[PDB]
Amino acid sequence: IEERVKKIIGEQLGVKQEEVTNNASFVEDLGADSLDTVELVMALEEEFDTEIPDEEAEKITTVQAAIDYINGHQ
């Protein structure tokens, strides 16, 4: 569900859940960095009982990408 994903991103990068948008990029739009996105992927892994490879973690750079990955694999 997009709600919990948005909540997690909003918490991790310290921005209100409403500000984040699906097309926004973690590093470019939300000002994240390498460790921030690592924490993002790991938190999403643990939240939804999912696992991600490094090949994909580097691929998921936007909110919508994470949404597609999580919903497809759910």
Binding site: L35, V38, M42, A43, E45, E46, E47
Partner: protein, 722 residues
């Protein structure tokens, strides 16, 4: 959910504060200060079953030269060769000492006899000495009184022009060690609080916050020392200056740390937006069982020392354990109470943002890449063993006391005119079943004397056949006087005095003892005295048992702690592997403290570690080091529920800063003891300080979380997860 115990502490806040304030006034008024109690309740240093100790008693009893293992030597020094005027002074001084049957059991007078005076006179002729057998064992309250009586008598006697006198010996040094330890207690605490005050001020940037925290410590300290004094004053336990000094610092250190956790977690609750009451209960749930778990750890761990054999380590058992339990009880009760009252007036709210970005970033790296960090941190912990091959323990108590103490002053006079061994003689005695006052036996004794003289490290061998310690009938009247001090008065035993070349306190000197027993035994074999029992005693003889004793019981202390601490952690966390990791990582980290402590003292400072340092420091390192792991691991238990890796990361965000401040305070609190005149305790303080500094910055920060992520669900076996 508000736990009942926290609810009543909340409800009875002010009464609790009043109650403990009353305990701190009833104590320190109705009992003498803990330093005074230690003076009146000191313990003997020699274990009662050491072959060296009982040999010393046996030797004295047969020769009627007292029954204690506490001898002392009076040294005479003059700017010119000691003329007959000095002898007149010496005779009067001896006469007074022989009269005081209460303290000076017997005086082995040699310089007064021409037939043996030259054997005690200095080679330059400017110095001489005489030995005394004082009542009461070494370090006992009677012995300290007796030494003072002897010292007063020496001072009272007016010396002739250009003549000085001093009192030395293991008994005198032990007493002066006690006074120096007590005398420096004020400076240890004043520096400790002053340094802690500066550190806490920077951490909290709030003077009011620090003052309440320290006052909590002060009540924690006074009750801790107060109760132990009560037990000591009632005679239930024996004390030593190490117990008094070590207990004081631990109470201030452990007292402050429990305060930091209480304020730390509570302040975090306020940052999250919790209400004053809700923040208080949140603080209790996250830190109450941690403090109790950590409180029993220090009390339990130090109690394991009670199982040690040496009196130094044995006497640390109860005084520290009882003291820590009291300080913990104040922390778990006065801690929340003062916090609640302080909150009522709005004093404890954080004055700066509780940043967690720095630590969370570390957590992300550690949890995402556990093994690469684990190996890196594990290796740097083991490389501290590089000092083990070159580790050399030392026993020279002289070097670990100020130069100016009276005991060292006299020793300095001894070295100025005698070889360093002349003030630390060994005495060898053999018991037969018949009289020896015949030429036939005398020849056997002479053969024994010759054999020992050639033993490595030996310099002189006094004997009835060697009145002056060198080559030379016994029925002569003058020789009869000499015979009265080398043979049993009318018994079946004889004795010799052995002087080494080089200090016996060196490990090489210790090795010489077994050669003496072997050489004496083989020389006694093949001759009628072959069946004669052999007794060996002296400075080297005593420390042969110390070396074998300390090196062994260290395992008894350290190993017992691992089992005891592991049990306390296991009952707290209810998790098997988690308990093992909590104490396991610290155990592996002992190597880092070993290397650091040795590197600083033995190599950088060129001062060897005292034999007490490792056994006393290891227990604290193994106890306090596990407390920080307990706090962090306990925070994993609460935070988990979102996910193991996520819980670890956010857990280190919260407890990351709190532990570091707590760790530095304890490390600095234990390191501040270096200012003590008793350099032995300073090494104990510094060794603990360096080890805990290492544990907080690497073991807790990287090892435990890295291991925590690596194990996954099994880390909390058998507890269910998610």
């Amino acid at each position: 959910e508000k736990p009942f115990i926290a609810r009543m502490i909340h409800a009875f806040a002010v009464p609790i504060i009043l109650g403990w304030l009353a305990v701190c006034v009833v104590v320190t008024v109705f009992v003498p200060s803990l330093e005074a109690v230690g003076q009146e309740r000191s313990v003997s240093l020699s274990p009662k079953d050491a072959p060296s100790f009982e040999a010393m008693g046996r030797i004295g009893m047969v020769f009627k030269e007292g029954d204690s293992d506490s001898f002392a030597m009076v040294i005479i020094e003059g700017n010119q060769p000691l003329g007959d005027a000095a002898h007149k002074y010496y005779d009067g001084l001896v006469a007074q000492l022989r009269a005081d049957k209460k303290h000076v059991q017997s005086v082995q007078d040699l310089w007064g006899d021409p037939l043996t005076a030259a054997g005690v006179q200095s080679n330059d002729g400017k110095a001489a000495y005489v030995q005394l057998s004082l009542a009461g064992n070494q370090g006992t309250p009677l012995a300290n009184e007796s030494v003072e009586a002897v010292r007063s008598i020496v001072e009272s006697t007016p010396a002739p022009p250009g003549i000085k006198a001093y009192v030395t010996g293991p008994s005198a040094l032990a007493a002066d060690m006690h006074h120096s330890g007590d005398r420096s207690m004020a400076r240890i605490t004043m520096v400790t609080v002053a340094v802690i005050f500066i550190m806490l001020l920077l951490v909290y940037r709030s003077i009011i916050t620090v003052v309440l925290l320290l006052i909590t410590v002060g009540v924690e300290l006074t009750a801790a020392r107060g109760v132990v004094a009560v037990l000591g004053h009632s005679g239930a336990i024996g004390l030593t200056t190490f117990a008094v000094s070590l207990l004081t610092s631990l109470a201030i250190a452990a007292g402050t740390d429990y305060g930091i956790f209480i304020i730390g977690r509570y302040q975090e609750a306020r940052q999250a937006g919790e209400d004053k009451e809700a923040a208080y209960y949140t603080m209790y749930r996250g830190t109450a069982h941690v403090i109790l778990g950590s409180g029993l750890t220090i009390a339990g761990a130090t109690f394991c020392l009670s199982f040690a054999r040496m009196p130094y380590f044995q006497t640390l058992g109860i005084p520290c354990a009882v003291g820590m339990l009291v300080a913990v009880a104040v922390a778990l009760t006065l801690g929340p109470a003062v916090l609640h009252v302080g909150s009522r007036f709005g004093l404890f709210d954080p004055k700066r943002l509780l940043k967690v970005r720095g630590w969370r970033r570390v957590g992300t790296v550690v949890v995402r890449w556990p093994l690469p960090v684990l190996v890196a941190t594990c290796a740097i912990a083991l490389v501290g063993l590089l000092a083990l091959p070159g580790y050399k323990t030392s026993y020279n108590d002289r070097d670990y006391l100020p130069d100016f103490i009276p005991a060292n002053q006299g020793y300095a006079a001894a070295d100025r005119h005698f070889s360093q061994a002349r003030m630390k003689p060994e005495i060898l005695m053999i018991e037969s079943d018949h009289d020896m006052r015949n030429p036939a036996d005398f020849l056997v004794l002479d053969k024994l004397a010759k054999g020992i003289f050639r033993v490595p490290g030996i310099s002189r061998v006094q004997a009835i056949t060697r009145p002056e310690g060198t080559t030379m009938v016994f029925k002569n009247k003058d020789f009869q006087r000499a015979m009265k001090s080398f043979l049993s008065s009318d018994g079946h035993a004889a004795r010799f005095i052995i002087l080494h070349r080089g200090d016996p306190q060196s490990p090489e000197g210790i090795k010489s003892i077994d050669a003496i027993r072997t050489a004496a035994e083989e020389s006694l074999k093949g001759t009628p005295l072959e069946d004669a029992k052999i007794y060996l005693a002296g400075t080297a003889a005593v420390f042969h048992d110390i070396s074998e004793g300390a090196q062994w019981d260290l395992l008894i202390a350290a190993i017992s702690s691992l089992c005891l601490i592991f049990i306390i952690m296991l009952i707290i966390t209810r998790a098997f592997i988690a308990a093992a990791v909590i104490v396991g990582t610290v155990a592996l980290s002992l190597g880092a403290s070993f290397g650091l402590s040795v590197l600083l003292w033995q190599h950088i400072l060129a001062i060897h570690l005292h034999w007490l340092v490792l056994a006393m420091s290891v227990i604290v390192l193994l106890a306090v080091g596990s407390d920080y792991n307990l706090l962090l691991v306990s925070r994993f238990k609460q935070e988990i529920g979102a996910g193991l890796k996520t819980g670890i990361i956010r857990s280190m965000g919260g407890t990351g800063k709190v532990v570091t401040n707590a760790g530095l305070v304890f490390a600095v609190t234990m390191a501040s003891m270096a200012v003590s005149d008793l350099r032995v305790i300073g090494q104990v303080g510094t060794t603990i300080g360096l080890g805990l500094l290492f544990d907080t910055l690497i073991v807790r920060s990287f090892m435990t979380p890295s291991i925590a992520a690596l194990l996954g669900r099994w880390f909390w076996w058998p507890l269910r997860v998610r």
